[PDB]
Design an enzyme around this catalytic site. Structure first.
Site, short mmCIF file in Angstrom:
data_model
loop_
_atom_site.label_atom_id
_atom_site.label_comp_id
_atom_site.label_asym_id
_atom_site.label_seq_id
_atom_site.Cartn_x
_atom_site.Cartn_y
_atom_site.Cartn_z
N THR A 146 0.67 4.27 5.19
CA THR A 146 0.73 2.36 5.70
C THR A 146 0.93 1.57 4.27
O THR A 146 0.20 2.11 3.44
CB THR A 146 -0.29 2.13 7.03
OG1 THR A 146 -1.34 2.15 6.23
CG2 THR A 146 0.47 3.90 8.13
N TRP A 181 0.87 -2.89 4.53
CA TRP A 181 0.47 -4.51 5.02
C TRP A 181 0.13 -5.29 3.55
O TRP A 181 -0.97 -6.22 3.77
CB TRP A 181 -0.67 -4.40 5.98
CG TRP A 181 -0.62 -5.55 6.52
CD1 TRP A 181 -0.02 -6.97 6.91
CD2 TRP A 181 -0.93 -6.12 7.86
NE1 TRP A 181 -0.36 -7.74 7.88
CE2 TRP A 181 -1.25 -6.51 8.54
CE3 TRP A 181 -2.01 -5.04 9.17
CZ2 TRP A 181 -1.93 -7.81 9.37
CZ3 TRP A 181 -2.14 -5.11 10.55
CH2 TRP A 181 -2.68 -6.64 10.24
N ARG A 206 1.26 -0.21 14.24
CA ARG A 206 2.85 0.62 13.70
C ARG A 206 3.54 1.85 14.05
O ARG A 206 4.18 2.16 13.62
CB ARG A 206 2.77 0.21 11.04
CG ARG A 206 2.39 -1.28 11.35
CD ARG A 206 0.95 -1.03 10.07
NE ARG A 206 0.27 -0.44 9.72
CZ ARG A 206 -0.50 -0.75 8.76
NH1 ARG A 206 0.01 -1.28 7.67
NH2 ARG A 206 -1.63 0.47 8.91
N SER A 218 1.16 -0.98 -0.19
CA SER A 218 0.05 0.30 -0.52
C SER A 218 0.65 1.07 -0.03
O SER A 218 -0.01 2.24 -0.12
CB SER A 218 -0.75 0.23 0.92
OG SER A 218 -1.99 -0.64 0.60
N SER A 251 -6.25 4.36 1.59
CA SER A 251 -5.38 2.87 1.49
C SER A 251 -6.65 2.32 0.81
O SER A 251 -6.41 0.80 -0.24
CB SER A 251 -4.70 2.23 2.41
OG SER A 251 -3.67 3.16 3.04
N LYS A 253 1.25 3.07 -3.48
CA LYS A 253 0.50 5.05 -3.91
C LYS A 253 0.78 6.75 -3.77
O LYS A 253 0.16 6.74 -4.72
CB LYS A 253 -1.19 4.36 -2.95
CG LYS A 253 -2.09 3.38 -3.37
CD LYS A 253 -2.69 3.44 -1.81
CE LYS A 253 -4.12 2.26 -1.87
NZ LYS A 253 -3.15 1.02 -1.81
C1 LIG Z 1 -2.57 -1.98 1.41
O1 LIG Z 1 -1.45 -2.54 1.83
C2 LIG Z 1 -3.74 -2.67 1.47
C3 LIG Z 1 -4.81 -1.89 2.44
N1 LIG Z 1 -4.21 -1.11 3.08
C4 LIG Z 1 -4.34 -1.39 4.53
C5 LIG Z 1 -3.53 -0.78 6.02
O2 LIG Z 1 -1.71 -1.35 5.63
O3 LIG Z 1 -4.19 -0.48 6.29
C6 LIG Z 1 -5.05 -2.20 4.73
S1 LIG Z 1 -4.51 -3.86 4.89
C7 LIG Z 1 -4.60 -4.36 6.63
C8 LIG Z 1 -5.73 -3.11 7.10
N2 LIG Z 1 -6.64 -3.86 8.56
C9 LIG Z 1 -6.81 -5.76 8.07
C10 LIG Z 1 -8.61 -5.53 7.64
O4 LIG Z 1 -8.14 -6.12 6.61
N3 LIG Z 1 -9.16 -5.34 9.10
C11 LIG Z 1 -8.99 -5.40 9.68
C12 LIG Z 1 -10.54 -4.61 7.87
C13 LIG Z 1 -5.61 -5.47 7.36
C14 LIG Z 1 -5.50 -2.70 3.53
C15 LIG Z 1 -6.16 -3.87 2.89
C16 LIG Z 1 -4.48 -3.04 0.08
C17 LIG Z 1 -3.89 -3.73 -0.84
O5 LIG Z 1 -5.62 -3.28 0.26
#
Ligand SMILES: *C(=O)[C@@H]([C@@H]1NC(C(=O)O)=C(S[C@H]2CN[C@@H](C(=O)N(C)C)C2)[C@@H]1C)[C@@H](C)O
Length: 238
Positions: A182, A184, A224, A45, A92, A48
């Site tokens: 951020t 992940w 993080r 992410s 994100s 971006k």
């Molecule tokens: C980028 O890594 C993804 C995008 N970014 C991101 C983040 O790093 O905050 C989330 S993934 C992470 C966030 N919380 C977790 C989750 O899925 N939940 C608790 C809802 C995982 C987001 C997916 C991009 C690839 O989608």
């Protein structure tokens, strides 16, 4: 600021990561796993920031264009709405920047080799090369990238960089400013989380960081920021 307290912040989160810092082309390493600074991981992410730069520079979009949500079920529920390029940066929201990557095209996107980002390879699928390869970038290459973006020194137009910079503000307290983005990569083992940005100290002095650390599904998203903010507090950057 000791290089040993850094270790016990990471010892206690039960992780394995590195915190790269750059202050005017002098780089110091900080982690309980310092070798990760020269290890290639997918950008996730964090890409971006370069995706927005390449798009705004080539006029495939602008900071104002509103992206319609056309119904499909997305990962998080906060993504299911109309939003601009900036609001999609904060959240994100992946599907937005995917449509931007298709507007740019694989040929024009493979700008990446001009900026010299990571291994500079994107494969053939222009809408998921930053999430599962074949693009990989080292946390040192990341902190150097955001260092140029903060100082407004990336090979793009001056107005374009300042626009992306305005999309990345996270916390503004005590005359300080902290920009960052951020990431992940949850779909690869072992997982990897990012937090690359910079600090605008009250006197305008600039300090860039690039937090890399192995992730697990049970961690909070605020693990993080918590780990970074207590480390810039220790190094007396904030
Ligand atoms: C980028 O890594 C993804 C995008 N970014 C991101 C983040 O790093 O905050 C989330 S993934 C992470 C966030 N919380 C977790 C989750 O899925 N939940 C608790 C809802 C995982 C987001 C997916 C991009 C690839 O989608």
């Amino acid at each position: 600021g000791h290089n040993q307290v850094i270790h016990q912040y990471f010892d206690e989160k039960n992780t394995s990561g590195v915190l790269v810092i750059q202050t005017d082309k002098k780089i110091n390493l900080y982690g309980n796993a310092l070798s990760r600074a020269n290890t290639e991981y997918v950008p996730a992410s964090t890409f971006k920031m370069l995706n927005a730069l390449i798009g705004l520079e080539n006029q495939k979009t602008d900071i104002n264009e509103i992206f319609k949500w056309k119904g499909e079920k997305r990962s998080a529920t906060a993504w299911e709405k109309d939003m601009t390029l900036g609001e999609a940066m904060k959240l994100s929201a992946v599907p937005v920047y995917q449509e931007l990557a298709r507007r740019i095209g694989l040929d024009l996107m493979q700008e990446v080799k001009r900026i010299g980002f990571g291994n500079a390879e994107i494969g053939q699928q222009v809408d998921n090369f930053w999430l599962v390869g074949p693009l990989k970038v080292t946390p040192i290459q990341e902190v150097e990238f955001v260092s140029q973006l903060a100082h407004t020194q990336l090979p793009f137009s001056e107005k374009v960089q300042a626009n992306v910079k305005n999309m990345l503000l996270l916390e503004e307290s005590n005359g300080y400013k902290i920009f960052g983005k951020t990431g992940w990569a949850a779909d690869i083992k072992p997982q990897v989380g990012w937090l690359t940005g910079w600090v605008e100290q009250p006197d305008g002095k600039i300090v860039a960081f690039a937090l890399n650390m192995e992730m697990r599904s049970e961690m909070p998203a605020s693990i993080r920021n918590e780990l970074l903010m207590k480390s810039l507090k220790q190094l007396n950057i904030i």
